[PDB]
């Protein structure tokens, strides 16, 4: 009976439920090594001020 | 023991290196034709004639002192006279500032990597063989 739900992926739907549908602490920091990023406008905010 | 893998020495013109051989030839071409169009619109029958300051090679001299940051003596005044220059200002702003970025990059490092030691790739790669007596 385990093999059905794995084949039907219901576990994943539950895995979305008890980990990812309750994504709460909205930090979302991963970190990319690419230094090719243009600056934000907010990085240069007070210069206009 | 492995070979000594042949570092190349810098040349006499090693400061010309952080810009490829073509662009140096390309920029001179662009340098001249910019200057003549300025001189073209410089003397164009003002409807006395002795009105503008931009002379024959004087137009060339404005183009140089705009290019290298030293300034000039006199500014264009015409609508067409000024619309060429800011382009050339925008040109020379991008180019030689970008030159400095590559010019710093040559003064950073010159170490040839001399491939991977404590060998351990002799276990891993199949490229370079290795033997004993």
């Amino acid at each position: 009976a385990v093999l059905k739900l794995s084949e039907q992926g219901v576990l994943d739907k539950l895995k979305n439920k008890w980990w990812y549908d309750k994504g709460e602490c909205g930090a979302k920091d991963s970190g990319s090594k690419e230094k090719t990023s243009a600056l934000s406008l907010s990085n240069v905010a007070g210069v206009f001020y | 023991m492995i070979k000594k893998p042949q570092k190349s020495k810098p040349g006499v013109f090693s400061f010309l290196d952080p810009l490829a051989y073509e662009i140096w030839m390309c920029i001179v071409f662009a340098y001249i034709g910019v200057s003549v169009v300025l001189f073209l619109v410089s003397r164009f029958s003002p409807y006395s004639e002795s009105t503008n300051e931009f002379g024959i090679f004087n137009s060339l001299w404005f183009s140089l002192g705009a290019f290298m940051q030293q300034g000039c003596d006199i500014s264009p005044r015409s609508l067409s006279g000024r619309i060429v220059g800011g382009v050339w200002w925008f040109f020379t702003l991008i180019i030689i500032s970008s030159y400095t970025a590559n010019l710093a990059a040559f003064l950073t490092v010159e170490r040839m990597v001399s491939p991977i030691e404590s060998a351990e790739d002799l276990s891993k790669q199949t490229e370079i063989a290795y033997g004993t007596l």
């Binding site: 934000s40 406008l41 905010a45 | 169009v37 067409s80 619309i83 382009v87």
Partner: protein, 214 residues
């Protein structure tokens, strides 16, 4: 674009010669600046009263919270389209998250300026106040320095416009591949004209001054 500007530069050099080979109409310039300023007075108020400025993907109303809904987002009403209920416009303010960073009083004040139209509403105000004085050049006239104070309001309105643009963009990050609504450009477009009007007031001031000096 280097070479492309050159023949572009040469082209304008040609037409000046033939034009001389063979602004204008003061007085209707006074009529010209009215239709510019009044239409600028429109498009400012158009973009202000607009529920949509940028397209993005958020929610409609929570606590619905399915995954994400595309959003017809603007200042007050963060109204949503393309969902199980389309056109349900939420009112949004600042929200207390974890520990709130009150010591960031530069941020909390930036929050305090944000949930307000304070500069874009004030960008209407002097544009409206400048719209008052432009009619006053006939009724109770020949004071002719109150005309000078009118264009001050238009230029200062664009100052009030441009700063509200920044803080709203500062609020956006404050990938998603968000786009913009056309109504967002309207304050930017009117920003141009509000400066294009007030410069013409200075001409009309100084020419009336030149008519005063004689």
């Amino acid at each position: 674009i280097l070479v492309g500007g050159l023949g572009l530069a040469m082209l304008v050099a040609l037409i000046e010669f033939c034009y001389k080979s063979r602004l204008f109409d003061r007085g209707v310039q006074m009529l010209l600046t009215t239709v510019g300023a009044f239409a600028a007075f429109s498009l400012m108020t158009i973009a202000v009263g607009t529920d949509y400025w940028l397209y993005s993907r958020g929610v409609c109303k929570t606590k619905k919270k399915n995954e994400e809904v595309m959003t017809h987002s603007g200042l007050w009403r963060t109204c949503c389209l393309e969902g199980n209920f389309k056109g349900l416009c939420k009112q949004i303010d600042h929200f207390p998250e974890d520990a709130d960073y009150e010591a960031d009083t530069a941020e909390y004040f930036l929050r305090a300026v944000r949930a307000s139209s304070i500069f874009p509403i004030l960008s209407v105000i002097l544009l409206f106040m400048g719209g008052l004085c432009i009619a006053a050049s006939e009724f109770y006239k020949t004071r002719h320095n109150i005309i000078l104070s009118a264009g001050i309001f238009f230029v200062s309105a664009g100052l009030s416009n441009i700063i509200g643009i920044i803080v709203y963009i500062s609020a956006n990050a404050g990938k998603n591949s968000y786009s913009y609504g056309w109504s967002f450009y309207f304050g930017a477009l009117s920003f141009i004209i509000a400066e294009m009007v007030g410069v013409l007031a200075v001409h009309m001031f100084i020419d009336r001054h030149k008519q005063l000096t004689g």
